[PDB]
Design a protein that fits this description.
The structure is a homodimer.
Chain A (H helix, E strand, L loop, with lengths): L1 E2 L6 E6 L2 E7 L7 E2 L9 E7 L2 E15 L2 E9 L6 E2 L1 H4 L5 E3 L1
Parallel strand pairs in A: 3-8, 4-7
Antiparallel strand pairs in A: 2-3, 2-6, 5-6, 6-7
The complex binds ligand G52, chloride ion (6 copies) and sodium ion (2 copies).
Protein name (chains A, B): Protease
Subunit structure (chains A, B): Homodimer, whose active site consists of two apposed aspartic acid residues.
PDB class: hydrolase/hydrolase inhibitor
Amino acid sequence: PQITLWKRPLVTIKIGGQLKEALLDTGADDTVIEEMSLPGRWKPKMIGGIGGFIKVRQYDQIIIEIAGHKAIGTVLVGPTPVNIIGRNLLTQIGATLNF
Amino acid sequence: PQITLWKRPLVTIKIGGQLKEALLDTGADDTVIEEMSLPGRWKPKMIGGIGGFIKVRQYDQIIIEIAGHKAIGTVLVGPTPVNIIGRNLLTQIGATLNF
Ligand SMILES: COc1ccc(S(=O)(=O)N(CC(C)C)C[C@@H](O)[C@H](Cc2ccccc2)NC(=O)O[C@H]2CO[C@H]3O[C@@H]4OCC[C@@H]4[C@H]32)cc1
Ligand SMILES: [Cl-]
Ligand SMILES: [Cl-]
Ligand SMILES: [Cl-]
Ligand SMILES: [Cl-]
Ligand SMILES: [Cl-]
Ligand SMILES: [Cl-]
Ligand code: NA
Ligand code: NA
């Protein structure tokens, strides 16, 4: 689809069998999801945003549906205020910015 | 143009007579620029991200040239680690997300 930006670009995602809402975020390198359980091992990562840095859990090779498109890649879990779909997965669904 | 997302979507902007680089950020409601002077009145605001909140100055009716497209709106100025063009100005240049 085409998504205009008058409203937040929120879409439904499905991860771990659960539906969640997430923001399509071209300003995020990385996908970051609020606290939840995921399978497998995780690795540490620190990511930085407007207010400073947070510690997250990095899970690789996680299956995630985004707006009906299937992605498999890295998901960071931690105290993000909102679920954000970053460029690592926006590229897997073929998203571009156009003007 | 059509901007793919393999890399950060950085573009040249002109604001306050200054050229800067900024990220086109669909996950940002508002435009946030690193500390600089702008003319006219301003008022204080708090804006949150990952890592918490920062205090910014809110300037209304500021003209910014974004990748050669002129737009007017509110610009927040404060200690953001990166210049961010948010939805309030992305809409004005007709930017959409497509997949
Ligand atoms: C109300 O108006 C606002 C309020 C908040 C923001 S924001 O900058 O906090 N942000 C909101 C979002 C988290 C809901 C916009 C994002 O696009 C920021 C924009 C952003 C970019 C860089 C630095 C600070 C902020 N990106 C970000 O936090 O990315 C994180 C995750 O991936 C990494 O990529 C980024 O690049 C590496 C570090 C960050 C990490 C902007 C305008
Ligand atoms: Cl990935
Ligand atoms: Cl700059
Ligand atoms: Cl200045
Ligand atoms: Cl905010
Ligand atoms: Cl505005
Ligand atoms: Cl429109
Ligand atoms: Na894994
Ligand atoms: Na003003």
